[PDB]
């Protein structure tokens, strides 16, 4: 419940916007650190918000398509530096939240299966 | 003896930026 | 000097591409550090031209020019670092392939961020080899090896691991002369990172997919391998799939 409001507050912080690129990772780390302080929230859903905090900040496109009990995310328009940044936030927030994450990188697209 | 190349680096960019706008 | 910061600001107000915003500020931050007016005008000029083009690929190539000059334009510059920026601006002007122009500029920029004499020596010799060739596949591979070799020395690889990577550079330059495929050349870029990072490696071949699974890599190492392969395949024109799973990296060709 409180995680949903924290996401909006960090989203308004992110929507205002690699030194201005790593700040989005610090914002994504904060929601994962708060979703870890609020275990009531879904661990899978909390990591999906962190990727959204980065994508909505970077201004790239985010597509969501499930495949069963696991969710697949496809982010396009990324460059080499943004994919290095998006890989870091997804990996860190995964350790913080404790979900298994497989990432796929090809071209200007980063596929993340949670 | 080194700054001799520092001028050429600038001039190599001067034409690279300018002459690309000959159109 | 202050005007330099303005042109960079007036650029992001109309652009969105992360490189355009970033390179605009990087060229401005590296400007003040080098208060030689020659630098303070090339950056300013490159900015004003970037304000006059919707071609974002052109904008980035104009901003990489200012960043490359201002990095070596600082008085704290050795001869090798100045020689690398020269060959990287020559090798970029002569070619009309935007990959080679972006490749030679980004390879030197990452190389000039290291005072390591061995890395600066290898890059300079690599640029002098691509500047002395014509086969663009050889050039698009030499620039990919140098940019990946610099990312290892900047990351802080061992002096023994770097020499095990400089030999792959020789292997990468010679194999492209005989006429190696774009995929067998990227596979050498993968080996340079693995051997340069002192980690494991397993080579498997399925049809025409050369799956490479690497283990024992840290996040600080899985980002250097990601940024280098995405750069090499960008020049060589190879569709690569890089998969992670915590401490494992799986690269498929």
Residue numbers in the entry:
A (entry chain C): 2 to 18, 26 to 122
B (entry chain B): 3 to 25
C (entry chain A): 3 to 255
Which sentences from the paper describe this structure?
Several natural systems exhibit ‘facilitated dissociation’, in which an effector (E) can bind to a target–host (TH) complex to form an excited ternary complex (THE)20–26 from which the target dissociates quickly. We set out to design protein systems that undergo facilitated dissociation. We use a switchable target binder (host) and a flexible effector that can rapidly bind to and switch the target–host complex to induce a large steric clash with the target, forming a strained excited ternary complex. We show here that by explicitly considering excited intermediate states when designing coupled protein systems, a broad range of facilitated dissociation systems can be designed.
